């Protein structure tokens, strides 16, 4: 539905890309993460992308493997992840909240019973990291039956066949990994997500024609460096987020 | 999309990140081509026979069946070059890879047997081979690491948190993402995303074919049942394949029972797990109520996999195969029996299969039973594991 | 005796009188079994269905690149137990059973002959006792455990030197008293008659299989078969069938150690002197006044100061040609076969291999159909090769 | 030629068995071994058999295995033993001397040259430990060419075929070790064998007189006398006096 479309609207007639930070729900703890969430909004984050700690993250690199390990060994459950989402959505009822899921946490007790929960808590999108467009049919259904936008990675080895299917099936934004024609096929707006560490990389992305950028490792790399010092962690996130979102103006 | 069917009933699939899909599809296409090419079928067959040593022997147990009506044959994959049945699929995939133009093999290993399999096939077909190993297992396994390097491979220890088999698995997989044009990923079981279950069965199915032929020669009939251990499912599907349409032949797979099923530290997902999506596939796995992947336990490293190849899940759903479990202790006694009364040191994996055959015999000692147990591999690697248990026990 | 104890001048039964009855009884039992087609088939079923004969005849792929050498490897490393000794041990176990014997005695150093006798005894229901230098019992905990797992009884000898030549002493002392119930499993083709004959006969299927397989894959006999010669059993088992095929070279490779001129070798065939020892008249490394002198080689199995009597003979009549390979040539051949053929050879057999690469690289335009006897798996030599490389 | 016959003669004239000690030449050292040998003679040893240290003695047991390593490690050589033998023979021209040899030391550079050195220095008999009668032709030949008695062990698994062989080929004495032990001793006298000496486990004087009672001409003790030597390495003179005590008790156990 709307929260993503209502955001790329006002972002396009302010002539500016979107900045989406990525963080693992409940990392390093439930209460500290809530604060991390808010700091990121108050520093100028246009949308969120929250990950749900999973025992086995195939498709995430080193820094996100460890953030995932932090929250998981600490006991953060997917059920707790939803109680935090309810607090989040009710404090900032306008901001698009995407989820980064792993297939088995979606599939576990019904693909449909999942996407229902996302709808009723206020989530907006769901990226399933280990479900390619070829296996997506049952997730695209449950997604649409509950007004949840399915996000698909478009990789740099993508042929015209897949560009088609990402454009048709994909709503919200299209998460792409680094010069293209996804717009030609009427795809949801593209968000660059390959190696967004600098503000430099972010304006490199917008200048390249993207609707915005997502940085995962960079933002949680900050969490990792300041586990002992929760208040430093928050302040250093403010510096970074504001510095990045500003490189999109 | 997909030349071949990726599913076996519900189970199977290609549940992987989009970025990997071109590599799986190119792998599947190259494999379909080679399955039709008589020069590949001939070249592979020449390797299996003159380098690996196929056919392997089918040993009749003289002593341990005494005073019973059961006749126990042992299919001797322990005699295959490299000591285990994994050499079949490894030479197969190296052939496939040299055919695809690829010049590099990627692999990872835990205990280290698969690393050595890969390294030796890479050495033979002139492929540059790099093996990921958890930094822990590099300490534990200095002998294996040295064999791999003796054979030209490059062992790359991983430290990324964890630091065991399911963590090299990430570095090796991540690596493959970026180099599938140049390197083949040597998966080591009949599990994971399509086409790996199908390729692996096809490069292992000659175990059953030899066994069918060998038992027909010695006994003039088909066996009552074939028995094989089921960790990832590769040796079992290799023995089961040719018997699948011989309805009279019981297909029995043995999952590791750990310390007991009720204790919940086993490795028996087929019978005691739940379908979930993981390791690229939809398969029964051991998981918690909220869908985290549980840890499996077995005294045998080979059997210590929290899921199982999808074709086994399919065989169990339609009634063809019967899956049972055998505990550490049960497998321990089978292992000692075979050393003492047959002069064969089995691997602790195949020992689970042995133990279930002796159970079938010792429960009905007057039933006429012609059984085949697949001895998936040599037990020399397990001497220390076994010595420590027997020392602790006295 | 029933058969001829000599090969020309070499061989004999040079043992204390007390041991002659055991040896004659063994010979008579053997002569009888050799003419019983039911023994022959029993032995042959065992070799095929338990031990896994025939063994592969493998064609090197990369090793002979850019040369006209075609190099086959007879793969006794794939035999059950990892080495060619399984053949003679199963046959002796079968013969011991045929004689009513219920026990086996045996001697071991590094432990692989102990393991072979243990597994043959576990299969065939014999009660097996293995003598082993207490030195060698703590340097090989794994094989000791294997022999006990596969449980014979390992009797450690603390007499003088805890080494293989002092386990032979008590093994024999033991057989002396117990020959009516126990068979002594001599581990090579040396020693007193009928052992050099019995061992040849229970290994000759190596060469027979090779002749058949090579007549099948190349339609001709090979130019030369190459084997390392320590005790002499894998070599004579490779040679036996080819003795009457004049065209076929028989090349036996003794270990040159650090070099023949350094005196630390194990090549008594070409640099020793005929003497009497271990119950046979054979060339042996001996000091000027007739002490048996120490052999050296980095391969344990090749560290024998003498050689089987049939090789001394084949070399006297010039039918076989004996050369040497040094520690370091052998080492480099070990490394080559791992790196380029995916096979880890034993340090013994890699003396034979190394000589084949010498014959190849010195005449690489020359057409050569060579077979090399890979006498054993090399998983046992890893630590010896690891140290040596620092 | 002389000494074993002239000895066995007077022994049964004064009706008595012979006692023969075995020691290893140059054990524990050359100059100590000559003294050991003189003590053995002075305490009543009728003949003596000396072993030459060989690097790899098979037919031998643990006590003798080590006496051998002691002289070998000390670099006693066959040449040094032959010098000793001469010094020994020159001082007791009477007593029969037997060598206990290993084939290779006899064969090393000529069976015949070996036996001519024996005769040249005064030895009377050679026992080659690892030459059964079946292989003995060249050694017996060399022996008779040089008036050396060839000694042969008659073991307890010995059939009548071997007893006749031994009775024909042996000179000096039969070295003795399954029907009564006397029906080995009787069969040998029936075939007119050289007188029997029992050399199986002769360690205490009560075994020496048991050996003479069963009908043997005497008794040999290998390890028992060598045992005393190993016991007293630290104490060279206590050794000589423990051997004097032992040999005289041994020789007295044979005064019937
Ligand atoms: Na499993
Ligand atoms: Na030698």
* B155/B146 Cα distance (integer angstroms): 9
* C372/C70 Cα distance (integer angstroms): 11
Largest CA distance in chain B: 60
Asked whether residue B331 is domain-assigned, the answer is yes
For chain B, give percent helix, strand, coil, nearest 5: 45, 20, 35
Same-domain pairing of C215 and C319: yes
Nearest-CB residue to B160 (from A55, A62, A109): A62
Please give the C-alpha separations between residue D118 and each of B166, D2, D25, in angstroms, as whole numbers: 79, 15, 15
Last residue of one domain, picked from the residues C151, C180, C199: C199
Same-domain pairing of C115 and C250: no
Asked whether residue B2 is domain-assigned, the answer is no
Asked whether residue B1 is domain-assigned, the answer is no
Contact A135 B280 (CB under 8 A): no
Contact B291 A107 (CB under 8 A): yes
Contact D133 C17 (CB under 8 A): yes
Largest CA distance in chain C: 60
Closest-CA distance of chain B to residue A26, Å: 16
Contact B383 C145 (CB under 8 A): yes
Please give the C-alpha separations between residue C115 and each of C124, C129, C144, C304, D169, in angstroms, as whole numbers: 14, 11, 8, 20, 44
* D202/D209 Cα distance (integer angstroms): 10
DSSP character at residue C375? -
Same-domain pairing of C182 and C325: no
What is the phi/psi pair of residue C273, to 5°? Answer: -160, 135
- Could you tell me which of C379, C74, C337 has the C-alpha nearest to residue B123? C337
Residues forming beta bridges with residue B73, ordered by sequence position = B60, B372
Q: Which two tokens stand for residue D224?
A: 């028992």
- Could you tell me which of D142, D184, D148 has the C-alpha nearest to residue D167? D184
Q: Which two tokens stand for residue A168?
A: 């048709």
* B119/B115 Cα distance (integer angstroms): 6
Torsion of CA A116, A122, A124, A130, to 10 degrees: -50
B129 is catalytic: no
Nearest-CB residue to A135 (from B14, B166, B293): B14
Asked whether residue B150 is domain-assigned, the answer is yes
Nearest-CB residue to C122 (from B58, B340, B386): B340
Q: What CATH code is carried by the domain that includes residue B380?
A: 3.40.50.1100
Q: Which residues contact C330 (CB under 8 A, 6 or more apart)?
A: C255, C298, C299, C347, C350, C351, C354
B169 is catalytic: no
Residue-number span of the structural domain to which B293 is assigned: 53-83+205-393
Residues forming beta bridges with residue D22, ordered by sequence position = D49
Query: In this structure, is the dihedral angle defined by the CA atoms of residues C366, C367, C373 and C374, taken in order, positive or negative?
Result: positive
Q: Which two tokens stand for residue C367?
A: 């057409």
Burial class (CB in 10 A: 0-12, 13-18, 19+), A2: exposed
- Could you tell me which of C270, C265, C264 has the C-alpha nearest to residue C252? C270
Burial D196-230 (b: 16+ CB within 10 A, else e): bbbbeebeebebbbbbbebbbbbbbbbbbbbbbbe
- Nearest ligand, measured from the Cα of B307: 1
Task: Identify whether the C-beta of residue D242 lies closer than 8 Å to the C-beta of residue D236.
Answer: no
Please give the C-alpha separations between residue D59 and each of A74, C166, C218, D220, in angstroms, as whole numbers: 74, 12, 51, 16
CA D148 from centre of chain: 14
First to last CA, chain C: 53
- Nearest ligand, measured from the Cα of B233: 1
| Experiment type | X-ray
Burial class (CB in 10 A: 0-12, 13-18, 19+), D52: buried
Find the angle CA(A5)-CA(A9)-CA(A12) to the nearest 5 degrees: 135
Q: Element (H or E) spanning B183, and its range?
A: strand B183-185
Same-domain pairing of B271 and B370: yes
Asked whether residue C74 is domain-assigned, the answer is yes
* C41/C47 Cα distance (integer angstroms): 10
Contacts of B20 in chain A (CB under 8 A): 132
How many residues make up chain A in this entry? 249
Contacts of B124 in chain C (CB under 8 A): 61-62, 341-342
Contacts of C55 in chain B (CB under 8 A): 53
First to last CA, chain B: 59
- Nearest ligand, measured from the Cα of C254: 2
Q: Is B65 helix (H, G, I), strand (E, B) or coil?
A: coil
Burial B144-155 (b: 16+ CB within 10 A, else e): bbbbbbbbbbeb
Same-domain pairing of C271 and C130: no
DSSP character at residue B378? B
- Could you tell me which of C138, C57, C129 has the C-alpha nearest to residue B53? C57
* B353/B376 Cα distance (integer angstroms): 9
Same-domain pairing of B183 and B292: no
Asked whether residue C268 is domain-assigned, the answer is yes
Q: Which residues contact B356 (CB under 8 A, 6 or more apart)?
A: B227, B252, B254, B324, B326, B330
Beta strand residue intervals within D28-173, DSSP E? 48-51, 97-101, 125-128, 149-151, 153-154
CA C124 from centre of chain: 22
* B199/D241 Cα distance (integer angstroms): 87
Same-domain pairing of B65 and B131: no
Task: Identify whether the C-beta of residue C154 lies closer than 8 Å to the C-beta of residue C130.
Answer: yes
**Long-range residue pairs from A3-9, CB within 8 A, at least 24 positions apart, any chain:** A3/A94, A3/A95, A3/A96, A3/A97, A3/A124, A4/A47, A4/A96, A4/A124, A4/A125, A4/A149, A4/A171, A4/A172, A4/A173, A4/A188, A6/A94, A7/A46, A7/A47, A7/A96, A8/A173, A8/A189, A8/A211
- Could you tell me which of B322, B371, B366, B357 has the C-alpha nearest to residue B224? B371
Find the angle CA(B46)-CA(B52)-CA(B57) to the nearest 5 degrees: 105
Task: Identify whether the C-beta of residue B30 lies closer than 8 Å to the C-beta of residue A166.
Answer: no
Asked whether residue C1 is domain-assigned, the answer is no
Q: Please report the DSSP string for C279-304 in residue order.
A: TEEEEE-B-TTSPBPPP--SSGGG--
Q: Which residues surround ligand 1, an ion (CB under 5 A)?
A: B 231, 267, 305, 308
How far does the centroid of ligand 2 lie from the alpha carbon of residue D103, in Å?
A: 20
Task: Identify whether the C-beta of residue D43 lies closer than 8 Å to the C-beta of residue D247.
Answer: yes
Last residue of one domain, picked from the residues B154, B174, B200: B200
Same-domain pairing of C251 and C355: yes
* C92/B212 Cα distance (integer angstroms): 32
Number of cross-chain residue pairs from C and D with Cβ atoms under 8 Å apart: 83
Same-domain pairing of B322 and B366: yes
Tell me how crowded residue A16 is: count the other CB atoms within 10 A of its CB: 17
Torsion of CA D230, D234, D238, D239, to 10 degrees: 30
Same-domain pairing of B74 and B169: no
* B298/C203 Cα distance (integer angstroms): 42
Q: Element (H or E) spanning B90, and its range?
A: helix B86-99
Enumerate neighbours of B (3 or more CB pairs within 8 A): A, C
Ranges of H-type helices in chain A = 5-12, 30-42, 62-73, 78-91, 103-107, 111-121, 137-145, 160-169, 199-207, 217-225, 230-246
What total of structural domains would you count in chain B? Answer: 2
Closest-CA distance of chain C to residue B52, Å: 8
* D195/B326 Cα distance (integer angstroms): 73
Contacts of B18 in chain A (CB under 8 A): 132-133, 152-155, 158, 162
What is the phi/psi pair of residue B287, to 5°? Answer: -145, 155
Task: Identify whether the C-beta of residue B184 lies closer than 8 Å to the C-beta of residue B100.
Answer: yes
Q: Is B163 helix (H, G, I), strand (E, B) or coil?
A: coil
Contact C59 B50 (CB under 8 A): yes
Place of tokens 């390392």: C228
Nearest C-alpha in B relative to C336: B151
DSSP character at residue C379? G
First to last CA, chain A: 26
Q: A touches D (3+ CB pairs < 8 Å)?
A: no
Tell me how crowded residue D187 is: count the other CB atoms within 10 A of its CB: 18
Same-domain pairing of B154 and B288: no
Find the angle CA(C379)-CA(C383)-CA(C389) to the nearest 5 degrees: 120
Please give the C-alpha separations between residue A192 and each of A15, A21, A153, A201, C364, in angstroms, as whole numbers: 17, 12, 10, 10, 59
Same-domain pairing of C95 and C58: no
- Could you tell me which of D7, D29, D26, D32 has the C-alpha nearest to residue D18? D7
């Amino acid at each position: 539905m709307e929260r993503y479309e209502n955001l790329f609207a006002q972002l396009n007639d302010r002539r500016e890309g979107a900045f989406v930070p990525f963080v693992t729900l409940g990392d390093p703890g439930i209460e500290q993460s809530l604060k991390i969430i808010d700091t990121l909004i108050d520093a100028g984050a246009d949308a969120l992308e929250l990950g749900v700690p999973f025992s086995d993250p195939l498709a995430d690199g080193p820094t996100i493997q460890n953030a995932n390990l932090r929250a998981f060994a600490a006991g953060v459950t997917p059920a707790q992840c939803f109680e935090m989402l309810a607090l989040i959505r009710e404090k900032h009822p306008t901001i698009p909240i995407g989820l980064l899921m792993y297939a088995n946490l979606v599939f576990n007790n019904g693909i449909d019973a999942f996407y229902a929960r996302c709808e009723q808590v206020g989530v907006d999108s769901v990226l399933v990291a280990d479900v390619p467009v070829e296996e997506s049919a049952p997730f695209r259904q449950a997604a649409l039956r509950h007004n949840i936008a399915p996000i698909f990675i478009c990789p740099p080895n993508a042929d015209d066949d897949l560009l088609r299917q990402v454009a048709s099936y994909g709503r919200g934004y299209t998460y792409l990994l680094s010069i293209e024609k996804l717009k030609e096929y009427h795809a949801a707006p593209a968000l660059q997500g390959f190696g967004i560490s600098s503000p430099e990389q972010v304006s490199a992305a917008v200048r390249a024609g993207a609707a915005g950028a997502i940085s995962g490792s960079a933002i949680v790399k900050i969490i990792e460096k300041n586990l002992a010092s929760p208040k430093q962690m928050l302040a250093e996130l403010r510096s970074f987020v504001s510095a990045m979102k500003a490189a999109s103006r």
